[PDB]
Tab-separated table of C-alpha atoms (C1' of nucleotides) in Angstrom:
chain	number	residue	atom	x	y	z
A	1	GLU	CA	75.436	88.072	-36.298
A	2	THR	CA	74.621	84.399	-35.714
A	3	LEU	CA	78.282	83.497	-36.291
A	4	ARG	CA	79.236	86.104	-33.688
A	5	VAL	CA	76.620	84.954	-31.167
A	6	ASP	CA	77.468	81.257	-30.916
A	7	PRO	CA	80.476	80.233	-28.786
A	8	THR	CA	81.338	77.100	-30.761
A	9	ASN	CA	84.368	77.427	-33.033
A	10	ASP	CA	85.086	73.865	-34.215
A	11	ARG	CA	83.259	70.806	-35.507
A	12	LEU	CA	83.908	68.823	-32.319
A	13	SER	CA	82.549	71.598	-30.092
A	14	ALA	CA	79.481	71.956	-32.318
A	15	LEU	CA	78.848	68.204	-32.152
A	16	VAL	CA	79.249	68.238	-28.361
A	17	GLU	CA	76.789	71.131	-28.052
A	18	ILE	CA	74.315	69.377	-30.363
A	19	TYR	CA	74.549	66.176	-28.314
A	20	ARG	CA	74.077	68.082	-25.050
A	21	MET	CA	71.021	69.843	-26.489
A	22	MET	CA	69.591	66.576	-27.835
A	23	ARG	CA	70.312	64.361	-24.799
A	24	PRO	CA	70.741	66.383	-21.596
A	25	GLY	CA	72.299	64.663	-18.613
A	26	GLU	CA	74.599	62.364	-20.592
A	27	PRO	CA	78.411	62.458	-20.822
A	28	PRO	CA	79.530	64.215	-24.017
A	29	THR	CA	81.489	61.705	-26.105
A	30	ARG	CA	82.861	62.542	-29.545
A	31	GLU	CA	81.937	59.253	-31.225
A	32	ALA	CA	78.521	59.201	-29.538
A	33	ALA	CA	77.835	62.777	-30.654
A	34	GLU	CA	78.956	61.969	-34.203
A	35	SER	CA	76.697	58.906	-34.315
A	36	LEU	CA	73.750	60.904	-32.965
A	37	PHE	CA	74.254	63.665	-35.538
A	38	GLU	CA	74.602	61.134	-38.364
A	39	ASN	CA	71.438	59.291	-37.309
A	40	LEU	CA	69.446	62.501	-36.771
A	41	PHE	CA	69.090	63.314	-40.476
A	42	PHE	CA	71.485	61.160	-42.557
A	43	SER	CA	70.315	57.652	-41.580
A	44	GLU	CA	67.939	55.790	-43.886
A	45	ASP	CA	66.094	53.968	-41.098
A	46	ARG	CA	65.938	56.843	-38.603
A	47	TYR	CA	65.155	59.608	-41.121
A	48	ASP	CA	63.005	58.996	-44.196
A	49	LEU	CA	61.379	61.414	-46.638
A	50	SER	CA	58.547	60.155	-48.814
B	1	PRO	CA	38.168	54.648	3.578
B	2	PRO	CA	37.648	51.697	1.221
B	3	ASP	CA	34.092	52.648	0.233
B	4	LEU	CA	35.291	55.899	-1.342
B	5	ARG	CA	37.561	53.726	-3.538
B	6	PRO	CA	35.494	50.565	-4.053
B	7	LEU	CA	36.211	47.476	-6.153
B	8	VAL	CA	33.054	47.051	-8.234
B	9	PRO	CA	32.581	43.588	-9.792
B	10	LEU	CA	32.663	43.501	-13.586
B	11	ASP	CA	30.145	40.640	-14.125
B	12	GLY	CA	33.013	38.402	-15.289
B	13	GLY	CA	34.689	37.576	-11.992
B	14	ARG	CA	37.162	40.470	-12.240
B	15	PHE	CA	37.441	43.660	-10.190
B	16	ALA	CA	37.964	47.164	-11.587
B	17	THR	CA	40.989	48.464	-9.698
B	18	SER	CA	40.734	52.166	-8.913
B	19	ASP	CA	43.616	54.550	-9.551
B	20	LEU	CA	43.814	55.413	-5.848
B	21	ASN	CA	44.083	51.714	-4.990
B	22	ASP	CA	46.991	51.294	-7.416
B	23	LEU	CA	48.749	54.371	-6.022
B	24	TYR	CA	48.297	53.116	-2.454
B	25	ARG	CA	49.624	49.688	-3.446
B	26	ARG	CA	52.690	51.285	-5.038
B	27	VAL	CA	53.323	53.448	-1.966
B	28	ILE	CA	52.944	50.470	0.384
B	29	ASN	CA	55.313	48.363	-1.726
B	30	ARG	CA	57.915	51.135	-1.795
B	31	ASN	CA	57.636	51.626	1.970
B	32	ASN	CA	58.032	47.889	2.590
B	33	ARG	CA	61.083	47.627	0.332
B	34	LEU	CA	62.642	50.721	1.914
B	35	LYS	CA	62.100	49.194	5.361
B	36	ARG	CA	63.726	45.959	4.184
B	37	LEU	CA	66.697	47.867	2.753
B	38	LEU	CA	67.115	49.883	5.959
B	39	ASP	CA	66.986	46.725	8.083
B	40	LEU	CA	69.636	45.176	5.800
B	41	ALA	CA	72.396	47.638	6.841
B	42	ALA	CA	72.689	48.747	3.221
B	43	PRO	CA	75.219	51.433	2.184
B	44	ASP	CA	74.452	55.128	1.749
B	45	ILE	CA	73.958	55.337	-2.031
B	46	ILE	CA	71.457	52.474	-2.228
B	47	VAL	CA	69.298	53.706	0.658
B	48	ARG	CA	69.472	57.268	-0.691
C	1	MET	CA	89.041	55.487	-17.046
C	2	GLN	CA	86.583	52.800	-15.967
C	3	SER	CA	84.079	53.926	-13.341
C	4	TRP	CA	81.413	52.312	-11.172
C	5	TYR	CA	77.720	52.894	-11.889
C	6	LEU	CA	74.490	51.618	-10.329
C	7	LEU	CA	71.552	50.319	-12.378
C	8	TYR	CA	67.990	49.410	-11.509
C	9	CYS	CA	67.121	46.155	-13.275
C	10	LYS	CA	63.633	44.911	-14.064
C	11	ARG	CA	62.187	42.295	-11.722
C	12	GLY	CA	62.975	38.829	-13.072
C	13	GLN	CA	65.416	39.766	-15.848
C	14	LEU	CA	68.383	40.508	-13.579
C	15	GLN	CA	70.026	37.294	-14.801
C	16	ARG	CA	69.507	37.973	-18.508
C	17	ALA	CA	70.676	41.551	-17.949
C	18	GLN	CA	73.838	40.141	-16.365
C	19	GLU	CA	74.474	37.846	-19.338
C	20	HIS	CA	73.849	40.712	-21.771
C	21	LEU	CA	76.261	42.974	-19.873
C	22	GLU	CA	78.946	40.266	-19.818
C	23	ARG	CA	78.371	39.923	-23.566
C	24	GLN	CA	79.469	43.562	-23.958
C	25	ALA	CA	82.637	42.913	-21.889
C	26	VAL	CA	82.098	45.154	-18.865
C	27	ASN	CA	82.622	44.334	-15.202
C	28	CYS	CA	79.504	43.489	-13.197
C	29	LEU	CA	78.843	42.994	-9.498
C	30	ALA	CA	75.871	42.080	-7.308
C	31	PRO	CA	75.996	40.860	-3.687
C	32	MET	CA	75.320	37.155	-3.203
C	33	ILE	CA	73.885	35.394	-0.140
C	34	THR	CA	73.097	31.680	0.162
C	35	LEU	CA	70.248	30.545	2.412
C	36	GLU	CA	69.035	27.024	3.206
C	37	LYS	CA	65.341	26.180	2.899
C	38	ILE	CA	63.000	23.324	2.016
C	39	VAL	CA	61.864	23.040	-1.609
C	40	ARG	CA	59.854	20.072	-2.935
C	41	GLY	CA	60.613	18.182	0.277
C	42	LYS	CA	64.414	18.523	0.091
C	43	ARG	CA	66.630	21.066	1.833
C	44	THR	CA	68.735	23.186	-0.525
C	45	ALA	CA	71.128	26.112	-0.095
C	46	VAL	CA	69.777	28.472	-2.749
C	47	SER	CA	71.620	31.671	-3.653
C	48	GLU	CA	69.758	34.989	-3.629
C	49	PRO	CA	71.193	38.304	-4.918
C	50	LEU	CA	71.238	40.796	-2.060
C	51	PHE	CA	69.647	44.178	-2.785
C	52	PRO	CA	67.404	42.772	-5.539
C	53	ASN	CA	67.023	44.685	-8.810
C	54	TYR	CA	70.376	46.435	-8.377
C	55	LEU	CA	73.578	46.020	-10.385
C	56	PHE	CA	77.010	47.645	-10.135
C	57	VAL	CA	79.100	47.991	-13.294
C	58	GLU	CA	82.720	48.945	-13.820
C	59	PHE	CA	82.916	50.302	-17.361
C	60	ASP	CA	84.611	53.085	-19.298
C	61	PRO	CA	82.154	55.623	-20.780
C	62	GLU	CA	84.496	56.568	-23.648
C	63	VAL	CA	84.911	53.013	-24.962
C	64	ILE	CA	81.174	52.306	-24.513
C	65	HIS	CA	78.556	55.022	-24.126
C	66	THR	CA	76.161	55.239	-21.191
C	67	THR	CA	73.083	55.194	-23.441
C	68	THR	CA	74.211	51.850	-24.875
C	69	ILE	CA	74.165	50.350	-21.375
C	70	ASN	CA	70.831	52.061	-20.693
C	71	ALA	CA	69.358	50.367	-23.781
C	72	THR	CA	70.700	46.904	-22.912
C	73	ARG	CA	68.060	44.183	-22.728
C	74	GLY	CA	66.998	43.314	-19.192
C	75	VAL	CA	68.207	46.587	-17.633
C	76	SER	CA	65.486	48.930	-16.402
C	77	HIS	CA	67.318	52.234	-15.977
C	78	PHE	CA	70.477	53.850	-14.661
C	79	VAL	CA	70.313	54.988	-11.045
C	80	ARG	CA	70.890	58.736	-11.216
C	81	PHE	CA	70.555	61.875	-9.109
C	82	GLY	CA	69.915	64.988	-11.149
C	83	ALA	CA	70.805	65.114	-14.824
C	84	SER	CA	74.116	63.250	-14.571
C	85	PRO	CA	74.214	59.566	-13.575
C	86	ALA	CA	75.375	58.707	-10.077
C	87	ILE	CA	78.987	57.688	-9.428
C	88	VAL	CA	79.781	54.904	-6.953
C	89	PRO	CA	83.111	55.430	-5.136
C	90	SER	CA	85.598	52.578	-4.993
C	91	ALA	CA	85.280	52.285	-1.201
C	92	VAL	CA	81.616	51.288	-1.521
C	93	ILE	CA	82.605	48.518	-3.942
C	94	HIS	CA	85.405	47.502	-1.568
C	95	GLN	CA	82.913	47.085	1.276
C	96	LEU	CA	80.388	45.339	-0.993
C	97	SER	CA	82.991	42.783	-2.104
C	98	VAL	CA	83.911	41.968	1.507
C	99	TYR	CA	80.259	42.159	2.573
C	100	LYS	CA	79.441	38.669	3.896
C	101	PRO	CA	76.078	38.903	5.735
D	1	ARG	CA	32.607	54.920	4.840
D	2	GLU	CA	34.170	56.960	7.672
D	3	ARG	CA	37.054	55.018	9.239
D	4	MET	CA	40.430	55.965	7.754
D	5	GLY	CA	43.811	54.260	7.851
D	6	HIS	CA	47.397	55.325	8.364
D	7	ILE	CA	50.756	54.181	6.995
D	8	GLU	CA	53.890	54.682	9.100
D	9	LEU	CA	56.532	55.898	6.660
D	10	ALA	CA	60.019	54.761	7.640
D	11	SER	CA	61.457	58.006	6.240
D	12	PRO	CA	59.897	61.483	6.144
D	13	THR	CA	58.508	62.697	2.824
D	14	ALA	CA	57.678	66.311	2.029
D	15	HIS	CA	54.147	67.194	0.972
D	16	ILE	CA	54.091	68.057	-2.725
D	17	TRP	CA	51.319	70.642	-2.299
D	18	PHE	CA	53.470	72.841	-0.041
D	19	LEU	CA	56.580	72.385	-2.221
D	20	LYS	CA	55.579	72.692	-5.893
D	21	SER	CA	52.559	75.028	-5.757
D	22	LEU	CA	54.091	78.420	-6.524
D	23	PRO	CA	55.072	80.197	-4.342
D	24	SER	CA	56.726	77.284	-2.518
D	25	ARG	CA	55.812	77.316	1.167
D	26	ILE	CA	59.014	75.552	2.247
D	27	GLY	CA	61.139	77.816	0.061
D	28	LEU	CA	59.384	80.950	1.293
D	29	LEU	CA	59.708	79.873	4.933
D	30	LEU	CA	63.405	79.010	4.589
D	31	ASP	CA	64.119	81.926	2.192
D	32	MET	CA	65.984	79.678	-0.240
D	33	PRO	CA	65.546	79.209	-3.999
D	34	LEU	CA	63.347	76.335	-5.120
D	35	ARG	CA	66.180	74.768	-7.143
D	36	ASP	CA	68.255	73.748	-4.126
D	37	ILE	CA	65.032	72.725	-2.366
D	38	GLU	CA	64.221	70.177	-5.065
D	39	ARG	CA	67.897	69.182	-5.138
D	40	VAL	CA	68.009	68.312	-1.431
D	41	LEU	CA	64.486	66.850	-1.399
D	42	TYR	CA	65.209	64.498	-4.310
D	43	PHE	CA	68.692	63.587	-3.004
D	44	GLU	CA	71.050	65.692	-5.118
D	45	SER	CA	73.032	67.970	-2.773
D	46	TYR	CA	73.775	68.037	0.944
D	47	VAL	CA	72.470	70.795	3.210
D	48	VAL	CA	73.962	71.997	6.493
D	49	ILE	CA	71.806	71.966	9.633
E	1	U	C1'	13.529	53.708	-0.035
E	2	C	C1'	18.056	47.942	-1.260
E	3	U	C1'	14.308	45.114	-2.948
E	4	A	C1'	14.906	43.584	-7.930
E	5	U	C1'	17.709	45.055	-12.213
E	6	A	C1'	22.733	48.551	-7.321
E	7	U	C1'	30.989	49.897	-12.797
E	8	G	C1'	34.129	54.722	-15.432
E	9	U	C1'	36.728	57.138	-18.316
E	10	C	C1'	38.417	57.188	-22.999
E	11	A	C1'	37.512	57.340	-28.446
E	12	G	C1'	33.979	58.065	-32.126
E	13	C	C1'	29.822	60.799	-32.721
E	14	G	C1'	24.945	63.131	-33.050
E	15	U	C1'	21.129	66.504	-31.141
E	16	G	C1'	19.430	71.186	-28.727
E	17	U	C1'	21.843	75.220	-28.245
F	1	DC	C1'	59.195	13.721	-12.720
F	2	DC	C1'	57.445	17.268	-15.942
F	3	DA	C1'	53.886	20.199	-18.791
F	4	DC	C1'	49.607	23.106	-17.923
F	5	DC	C1'	47.855	26.345	-14.390
F	6	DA	C1'	48.225	29.894	-11.156
F	7	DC	C1'	50.798	34.207	-9.387
F	8	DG	C1'	52.565	38.184	-7.407
F	9	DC	C1'	54.669	42.075	-7.131
F	10	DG	C1'	57.232	46.705	-10.223
F	11	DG	C1'	55.450	49.390	-14.055
F	12	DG	C1'	57.864	53.611	-19.314
F	13	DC	C1'	58.258	50.591	-23.261
F	14	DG	C1'	61.481	48.577	-25.183
F	15	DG	C1'	65.804	48.304	-26.221
F	16	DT	C1'	71.336	46.787	-27.184
F	17	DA	C1'	67.374	54.572	-29.020
F	18	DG	C1'	64.228	57.198	-29.322
F	19	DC	C1'	59.381	58.484	-28.734
F	20	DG	C1'	57.289	64.704	-29.520
F	21	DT	C1'	55.993	68.725	-33.354
F	22	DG	C1'	48.751	73.938	-35.055
F	23	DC	C1'	46.904	78.467	-27.762
F	24	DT	C1'	46.339	82.134	-24.724
F	25	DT	C1'	46.977	84.359	-20.373
F	26	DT	C1'	49.350	84.823	-16.099
F	27	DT	C1'	53.208	84.101	-12.976
F	28	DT	C1'	58.023	83.168	-11.718
F	29	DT	C1'	62.720	83.289	-12.640
F	30	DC	C1'	67.158	83.972	-15.119
F	31	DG	C1'	70.977	85.862	-17.798
F	32	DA	C1'	72.859	89.785	-19.573
F	33	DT	C1'	73.515	94.182	-19.037
F	34	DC	C1'	73.406	98.649	-16.929
F	35	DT	C1'	73.870	102.091	-14.170
F	36	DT	C1'	74.571	104.346	-10.291
F	37	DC	C1'	76.843	104.597	-6.407
F	38	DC	C1'	80.883	105.007	-1.940
G	1	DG	C1'	86.952	101.088	-9.816
G	2	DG	C1'	84.315	97.037	-8.040
G	3	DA	C1'	79.767	95.961	-6.068
G	4	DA	C1'	74.724	96.048	-5.549
G	5	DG	C1'	70.460	96.454	-6.950
G	6	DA	C1'	67.801	96.516	-10.640
G	7	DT	C1'	65.615	95.991	-14.722
G	8	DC	C1'	64.295	94.274	-18.819
G	9	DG	C1'	63.685	91.175	-22.350
G	10	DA	C1'	63.499	86.331	-22.665
G	11	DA	C1'	62.748	81.491	-21.159
G	12	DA	C1'	60.096	78.232	-18.452
G	13	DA	C1'	55.981	76.590	-15.828
G	14	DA	C1'	50.816	76.394	-14.548
G	15	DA	C1'	45.802	76.601	-15.675
G	16	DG	C1'	41.727	76.944	-18.583
G	17	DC	C1'	39.312	76.164	-22.501
G	18	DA	C1'	29.828	76.433	-21.487
G	19	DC	C1'	25.820	73.137	-20.474
G	20	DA	C1'	22.385	69.046	-21.050
G	21	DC	C1'	20.958	64.619	-23.313
G	22	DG	C1'	21.140	59.899	-26.556
G	23	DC	C1'	24.042	56.005	-28.933
G	24	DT	C1'	28.262	52.577	-30.302
G	25	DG	C1'	33.052	49.818	-28.598
G	26	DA	C1'	37.312	48.451	-24.665
G	27	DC	C1'	38.531	46.966	-20.571
G	28	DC	C1'	39.407	47.458	-15.511
G	29	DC	C1'	48.032	44.893	-15.470
G	30	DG	C1'	51.532	41.225	-18.539
G	31	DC	C1'	55.164	38.010	-17.863
G	32	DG	C1'	59.085	35.671	-15.953
G	33	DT	C1'	58.357	32.622	-11.780
G	34	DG	C1'	56.935	29.109	-9.252
G	35	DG	C1'	54.016	25.400	-8.380
G	36	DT	C1'	51.074	21.384	-8.710
G	37	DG	C1'	49.205	17.546	-9.157
G	38	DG	C1'	48.729	14.475	-12.594
RNA sequence: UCUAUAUGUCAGCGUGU
DNA sequence: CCACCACGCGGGCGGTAGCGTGCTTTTTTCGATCTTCC
DNA sequence: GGAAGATCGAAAAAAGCACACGCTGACCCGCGTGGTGG
């Protein structure tokens, strides 16, 4: 049902949607969205689990 | 009126600035700069 | 393609913001007016940037993101109306370049 | 304690009490949604007179 | 009552409830 | 003629991004549908 | 057969969260920019 609900169908569209949700009012750029997604949870300095 | 927003001395030569005084100062500064910009024949985007 | 954007700059760090922006290789613009006055007993024609705390930049958002410019040292914040940042048409820049008050 | 002052604004500014306190007085009077009201007030979209 | 001694929130609390 | 002392207005801070994150009740609006018609 | 109103769940915004008293600390612009008078 969740797969049916969402309109995104590719990795680039998902990254663009994630960037728009994270930072509203900014131009959606593929490299910027990729960097934001990488730094959200897969960056040592930005994200750290004790 | 100033008495409703006074500047009480702090026994050390300083004055405790009230929040209303700061807001009025900010508004006056913005009005003055907007007047200067309008008198400068500035374009539409900047004055907007 | 490269577009024109307007930025509020913090009072006093307009110069260092300009150097930082030139370090990132983007086009910058700010009106310039020279006025003659007495300083320390001598008359000098000192330059003063018209419309203080305002910068215009020609830059391409794809090659360099807007948030990177927003985080540049010495720059206060992008001038924006609504969610999206404001866009300065080329005619405004044309007038500003030929603006000689 | 009684004498007040006045500041002559170079441009008109809408009172925030009559604009944001639901229901919006300006929006109700003009019969327009609040969204376009805040858009035009805060310089986002033109409006025809 | 101008005769003295003529700041406020915040944070931490505690007391009576 | 140059190093310590005012100083005077924007102000989100600081940075070449992101910061947050344990309530309930009421009111307003919005998207998605629906459903009923002329 | 398309439109209008309509409605219904869901999302977003605003306001409130008892009283009284006693005590402690921390100020109540920082910083690039003159500017000065040694």
